[PDB]
Amino acid sequence: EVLKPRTLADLIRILHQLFAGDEVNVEEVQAIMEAYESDPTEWAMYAKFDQYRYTRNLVDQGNGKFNLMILCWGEGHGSSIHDHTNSHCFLKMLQGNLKETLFAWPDKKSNEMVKKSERVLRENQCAYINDSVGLHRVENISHTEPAVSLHLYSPPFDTCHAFDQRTGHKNKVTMTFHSKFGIRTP
Numbered sequence: 001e002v003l004k005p006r007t008l009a010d011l012i013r014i015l016h017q018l019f020a021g022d023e024v025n026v027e028e029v030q031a032i033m034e035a036y037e038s039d040p041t042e043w044a045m046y047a048k049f050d051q052y053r054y055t056r057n058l059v060d061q062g063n064g065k066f067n068l069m070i071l072c073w074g075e076g077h078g079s080s081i082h083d084h085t086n087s088h089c090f091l092k093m094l095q096g097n098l099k100e101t102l103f104a105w106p107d108k109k110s111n112e113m114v115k116k117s118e119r120v121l122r123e124n125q126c127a128y129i130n131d132s133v134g135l136h137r138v139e140n141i142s143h144t145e146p147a148v149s150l151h152l153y154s155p156p157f158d159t160c161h162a163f164d165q166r167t168g169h170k171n172k173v174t175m176t177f178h179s180k181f182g183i184r185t186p
């Protein structure tokens with residue numbers, strides 16, 4: 001019963017429709033992103049890796065309503081524990097596997113941060129998070145293979161917080177793009 005995009009281009013077109021209004025049906029977006037069968041012939045132009053850290057590669061600016069990007073995780077690469085600046089966040093596997101670790105939010109007190117959930121995102125699976133769900137950290141499960149994920153944020157945001165797992169203290173972080181529309185950035 002779910003609308004199945006046949007290409008990454010179909011998916012983008014559907015997303016433009018589902019985010020045209022004021023109401024976002026989270027479960028419907030998630031199902032449609034999941035239904036798209038990752039095809040590396042369609043997204044290899046965005047798959048630009050770096051040796052030391054994961055890269056963020058803008059695919060579509062979603063008419064200001066959302067950002068759609070591809071994240072490329074080298075061998076062993078992982079993220080910090082971060083929030084999502086009051087946005088919706090969808091992340092779909094395109095290649096390999098990510099481990100998502102969900103954390104509880106810290107208090108004012110300093111303390112080791114608490115894990116609320118731990119899972120591996122399967123092939124083509126679409127996960128969802130926002131700040132009310134919790135914080136998370138995401139990482140390539142593999143030290144011999146890369147991972148590639150498709151992320152949708154609505155509204156778009158260019159800053160978030162990184163969290164120290166030992167204390168819960170946080171720092172503001174400005175996120176950058178490694179490339180946009182297949183073109184490397186400065």
Ligand SMILES: [Fe+2]
Pocket residue numbers: 082089136138
């Ligand atoms: Fe995230």
